[PDB]
Design a protein around this nucleic acid. Structure first.
Lengths: 141, 196, 674
RNA sequence: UUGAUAUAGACAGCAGGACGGUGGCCAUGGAAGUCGGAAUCCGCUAAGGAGUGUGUAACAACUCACCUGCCGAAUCAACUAG
RNA sequence: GUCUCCGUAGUGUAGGGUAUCACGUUCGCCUAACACGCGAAAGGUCCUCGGUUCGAAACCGGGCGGAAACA
């Protein structure tokens, strides 16, 4: 099983937290990490992102690789501190891009609309661009 | 939206039928949306899959394909549940990769199981807390090395019968594949021709 | 046989998962009907039996006696069958001709008892008569005239007395002390196996170091005194032999909890009757007199001068359920305290503690347990009328944020005025206070360095610490920011006393605050020292501090305390639900190394604890071990300033019980104009 | 009476599918669709609501409207007064 | 039940053109000091609400009250 299989996910981020973290409650899935495992997980997980920051943990006998899903919900809050146009295009490019696609424009609508509560390019709601998806609807491919 | 919806479905299937000259008929069985999504993704580059109620295509071809005849034989060929995948490349390649794309359809409650899957004698590795299920279903299992171990293979379910709820969840926890089914394939159409 | 087998397989499994003492230090603990360690009988009808008796009369009707009954005792229990046609057993589930047979167990054990029972419940007379001679039991008096179910009982009691059956079973299976000590002392004596007492306890040589351990203390006939119960493990005890008397908190290198006396007499206990005995050597139980006053709850008795303590007993339960005990009449308090001491001395788990406001709290396992405690207390331990109530939940107060304005007070002669400000605590610095990492005894420069480096604390005020709250150690800090002003140094003692009075004697419910900071900004002090007396400043300090604490959007906090609950897999949902309804959540749940046990820790407010164990048992089916310890304090969600808030109800009932003015005063009395 | 649906096959039963961000934001002791204060998207499709209800502390789990299979002719809703 | 009267500094009190006094508290004089005395300060949106007129605690309508008087 690749010598270890603890691939399950975790949903803490931003601050290290540690004591406030759920490491005591998720101990027995791998049984290896404990508090030292929690600390080494969050040392690489302090940044990227700044949110709940869902992570997927792949064990390394003692250490873990906390690969972050490029969750549009996570990354948008990671980017806002506003247009962020090319940044969100690039963020759409860096995810798995699948999202039940038909075209690049499909994921463009999906990820320019995912933040219907996080606003959008300067002074407009994240819907008008979605209707008029023409500016670089082929910019990713 | 319903009226414009039916109008749109008529138009889209009509255009895509004019576009693809050769198609192939699939039977959309009791298949999950995950598997259709995944095949439609795998098929996305090469083919197009689509289906709905089995009669808008009937009226479409029976009323809008007089100008393109030899599209009349499907009329007694599409009944029950059915799926259309319209493709341009070679037939044999599509046939093989579609029968290749398999999914482990789980053991849901109230489903017929025309396959015989019998549990063997091996260490399941499960913790010493779930033995109640086996003890109710009639399996004697003793903990080994801290793991649940079944001493001897015992018959579970025959073909074409009804599966139990505790049995279904047993198959689920063991994760061993029950009756698996994806796209079931019946007929093919190639510019006025019928084959297997 | 089916129900018997499930019962005994279940006990085997549940002794396998916990009793890890399998083959090795004790070998096979397993409970097994084959070899007679399993007995059958019904206590209502004074009868009990094992396979062994039926093995015996089967052999008789068919040194070497033991083996000749032991072969078929092995044969009888199990899945093996017996046939009546050939009068022979069989490992087969059916005859060679193809007919199934009932098993040897039913056919030779439960056929006869059922034949005895049906014939007498259906009143079969000559069948009973031929059975008794087939059963060849003596027909004693009074049984040939009566009839019915009492005849059933009498006759089959005479057939299989429980006395001899269980006497013989327990004599042959349970181990005598020589065998018991060889594997029992490792959890009995803290001393190394090389000490002289250790060899005595391992060997039970009744001519050396007298070992004892008093656990149960049964009341005497009189009323106030008791007998100390315990089993002798080593040596030989006699009347009036000087002996060391040490209890739990005793340490070998100190005389605390140490007493040197003899005993009064040696008394054997049997049922309700008692009997003095001259002496008792090792291995057995006995009661003693005169050990009453020099032990608390439990203790040990040793002739040897170097013997350490025995291992204090652990309980799965904890003193979790608590109820307040105060007398009906105020002049029974000493009578009451003697009652509480007697009660705590009798039952070896209860805890009688004086809480901060002085209430007498009796902490125990369950509601019925406490119920028996106060019943015995009001009957004999004090024999005094009593009043019952739940423990009062004590509350500490705090401010949500900074006081909006700079609060002002005036001396009653108006010769002085005070400017100061209030803040809350950014983190659990109060927790570090209670831990001791910040304290008054800590010196100014080093404490200042700690505060500045850890909590971004002002360097200018680093040397400006004044007071550490209640008693000078409480979780309330007073400092000064007033610059270059002159007679404030002669106000410090008065302001510190005023702040002490304010924190100990609070504002909203007249209670202590926690985690609140106070800094004095500006002062206008009368030039001469006579007009600014302590009776002229300290009241003003309290007025101004109450003003500040009211202005800062006051808040309340509850002693949310940890409940460590032990529970199996099946009813973790039960504890989840009960904590949910009682405003509690689990933060730590994990499996234990055995298998079936979950160790679970959850937060729970104290005011939600009343009756908590009762509903816990209701939802768990009596499958919970709810240990309770204090954890911390946390902000109570509602704002007491609103009337419809739960803090407002708390403050109202607290003011009511403390018998004060229900209305909170407005800022008029505290804050005064320039 | 008013309206609505229906060979582009209703209605009703039986059988399937009812997805990603997203365990959306803000509240947090725990709130993931479902305790709540706001916003209410898009991809995929036939379809799916950032959610019908049940449920979990939460999960989990079902359930729903959404669409599809069999089923092949009318059906359904709100009122009205004898 | 109907009717009559009355709702004011903490307390009680009188009273269209900005609530009097007494005590209650603070208060400052006097005294060696207390007491006593005296003085000032603070102190009531005048029961609430609607209207009326330049303006209402007052005048007129209600609602509460409290008190009697009848019944």
């Amino acid at each position: 099983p690749n010598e270890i299989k603890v691939v399950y996910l975790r949903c803490t981020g931003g601050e290290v937290g540690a004591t406030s973290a759920l490491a005591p409650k998720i101990g027995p899935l791998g049984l290896s990490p404990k508090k030292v495992g929690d600390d080494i997980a969050k040392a690489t997980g302090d940044w990227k992102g700044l949110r709940i920051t869902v992570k997927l943990t792949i064990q390394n006998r003692q250490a873990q690789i906390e690969v972050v899903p490029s969750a549009s919900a996570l990354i948008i809050k990671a980017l806002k501190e506003i247009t962020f146009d090319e940044i969100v295009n690039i963020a759409r490019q860096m995810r798995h891009r699948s999202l039940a696609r038909e075209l690049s424009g499909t994921i463009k609508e999906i990820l320019g609309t995912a933040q219907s509560v996080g606003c959008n390019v300067d002074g407009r709601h994240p819907h008008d661009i979605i209707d008029d998806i023409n500016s670089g609807a082929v910019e990713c491919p | 939206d319903r009226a414009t919806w039916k109008s749109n479905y008529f138009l889209k299937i009509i255009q895509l039928l004019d576009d693809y000259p050769k198609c192939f008929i699939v039977g959309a069985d009791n298949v999950g949306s995950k598997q259709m999504q995944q095949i439609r993704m795998s098929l996305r580059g090469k083919a197009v899959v689509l289906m709905g109620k089995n009669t808008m295509m009937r009226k479409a071809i029976r009323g809008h394909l007089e100008n393109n005849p030899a599209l009349e034989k499907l009329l007694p060929h599409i009944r029950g549940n059915v799926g259309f995948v319209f493709t341009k490349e070679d037939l044999t390649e599509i046939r093989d990769m579609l029968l290749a794309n398999k999914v482990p359809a789980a053991a849901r409650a109230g489903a017929i199981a025309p396959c015989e899957v019998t549990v063997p004698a091996q260490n399941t590795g499960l913790g010493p807390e779930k033995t109640s299920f086996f003890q109710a279903l009639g399996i004697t299992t003793k903990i080994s090395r801290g793991t649940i171990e079944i001493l001897s293979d015992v018959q579970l379910i025959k073909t074409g019968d009804k599966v139990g709820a505790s049995e279904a969840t047993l198959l689920n926890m063991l994760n061993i594949s029950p009756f698996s089914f994806g796209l079931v394939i019946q007929q093919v159409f190639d510019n006025g021709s019928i084959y297997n | 046989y089916q129900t018997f087998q499930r019962i005994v397989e279940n006990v085997n499994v549940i002794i396998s998962t916990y009793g890890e003492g399998e083959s090795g230090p004790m070998g096979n603990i397993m409970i097994d009907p084959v070899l007679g360690t399993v007995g059958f009988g019904s206590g209502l009808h004074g009868w009990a039996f094992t396979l062994k008796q039926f093995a015996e009369m089967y052999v008789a009707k068919f040194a070497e006696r033991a083996k000749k009954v032991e072969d078929m005792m092995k044969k009888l229990w199990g899945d093996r069958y017996f046939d009546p046609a050939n009068g022979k057993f069989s490992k087969s589930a059916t005859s060679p001709e193809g007919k199934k047979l009932p098993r040897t167990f039913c056919q030779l054990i439960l056929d006869p008892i059922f034949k005895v029972f049906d014939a007498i419940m259906n009143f079969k007379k000559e069948e009973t008569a031929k059975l008794i001679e087939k059963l060849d039991i003596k027909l004693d008096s009074e049984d040939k005239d009566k009839e019915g179910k009492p005849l059933l009982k009498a006759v089959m009691r005479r057939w299989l007395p429980a006395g001899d059956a269980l006497l013989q079973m327990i004599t042959i299976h349970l181990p005598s002390p020589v065998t018991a000590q060889k594997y029992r002392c490792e959890l009995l004596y803290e001393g190394p196996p090389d000490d002289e007492a250790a060899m005595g306890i391992k060997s039970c040589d009744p001519k050396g170091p007298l070992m004892m351990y008093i656990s149960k203390m049964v009341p005497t006939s009189d009323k106030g005194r008791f007998y100390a119960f315990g089993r002798v493990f080593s040596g030989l005890v006699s009347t009036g032999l000087k002996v060391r008397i040490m209890g739990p908190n005793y340490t070998p290198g100190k005389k605390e909890d140490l007493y040197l006396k003899p005993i009064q007499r040696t008394i054997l206990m049997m049922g309700r009757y008692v009997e003095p005995i001259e002496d008792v050597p090792c291995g057995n139980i006995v009661g003693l007199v005169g050990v009453d006053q020099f032990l608390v709850k439990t203790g040990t008795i040793t002739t040897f001068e170097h013997a350490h303590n025995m291992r204090v007993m652990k309980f799965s339960v904890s003193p979790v359920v608590r109820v307040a005990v105060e007398a009906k009449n105020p002049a029974d308090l000493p009578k009451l305290v003697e009652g509480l001491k007697r009660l705590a001395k009798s039952d070896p788990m209860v805890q009688c503690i004086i809480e901060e406001s002085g209430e007498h709290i009796i902490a125990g396992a369950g509601e019925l347990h406490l119920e028996i405690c106060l019943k015995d207390l009001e009957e004999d331990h004090a024999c005094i009328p009593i009043k019952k109530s739940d423990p009062v939940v004590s509350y500490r107060e705090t401010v949500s944020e900074e006081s909006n304005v700079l609060c002002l007070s005036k001396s009653p002669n108006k010769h002085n005025r005070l400017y100061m400000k209030a803040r809350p605590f950014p983190d659990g610095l109060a927790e570090d206070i209670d831990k001791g990492e910040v304290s008054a005894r800590q010196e100014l420069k080093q404490r200042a360095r700690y505060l500045a480096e850890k909590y971004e604390w002002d360097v200018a005020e680093a040397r400006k610490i004044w007071c550490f709250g209640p008693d000078g150690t409480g979780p309330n800090i007073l400092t000064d920011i007033t610059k270059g002003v002159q007679y404030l140094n002669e106000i410090k003692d008065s302001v510190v006393a005023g702040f002490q009075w304010a924190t100990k004697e609070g504002a909203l419910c007249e209670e202590n605050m926690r985690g609140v900071r106070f800094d004095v900004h500006d002062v206008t002090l009368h030039a001469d020292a006579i007009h600014r007396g302590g009776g002229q400043i300290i009241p003003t300090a309290r007025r101004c501090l109450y003003a500040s604490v009211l202005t800062a959007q006051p808040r309340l906090m509850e002693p949310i305390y940890l409940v460590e609950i032990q529970c199996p897999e099946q009813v973790v949902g039960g504890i989840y639900g009960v904590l949910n309804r009682k405003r509690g959540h689990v933060f730590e749940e994990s499996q234990v190394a055995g298998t079936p046990m979950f160790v679970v820790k959850a937060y729970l407010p104290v005011n939600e604890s009343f009756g908590f164990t009762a509903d816990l048992r209701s939802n768990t089916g009596g499958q919970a071990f709810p240990q309770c310890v204090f954890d911390h304090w946390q902000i109570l969600p509602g704002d007491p300033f609103d009337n419809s808030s739960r803090p407002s109800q708390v403050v109202a009932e607290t003011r009511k019980r403390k018998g004060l003015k229900e209305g909170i005063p407005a800022l008029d009395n505290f804050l005064d104009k320039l």
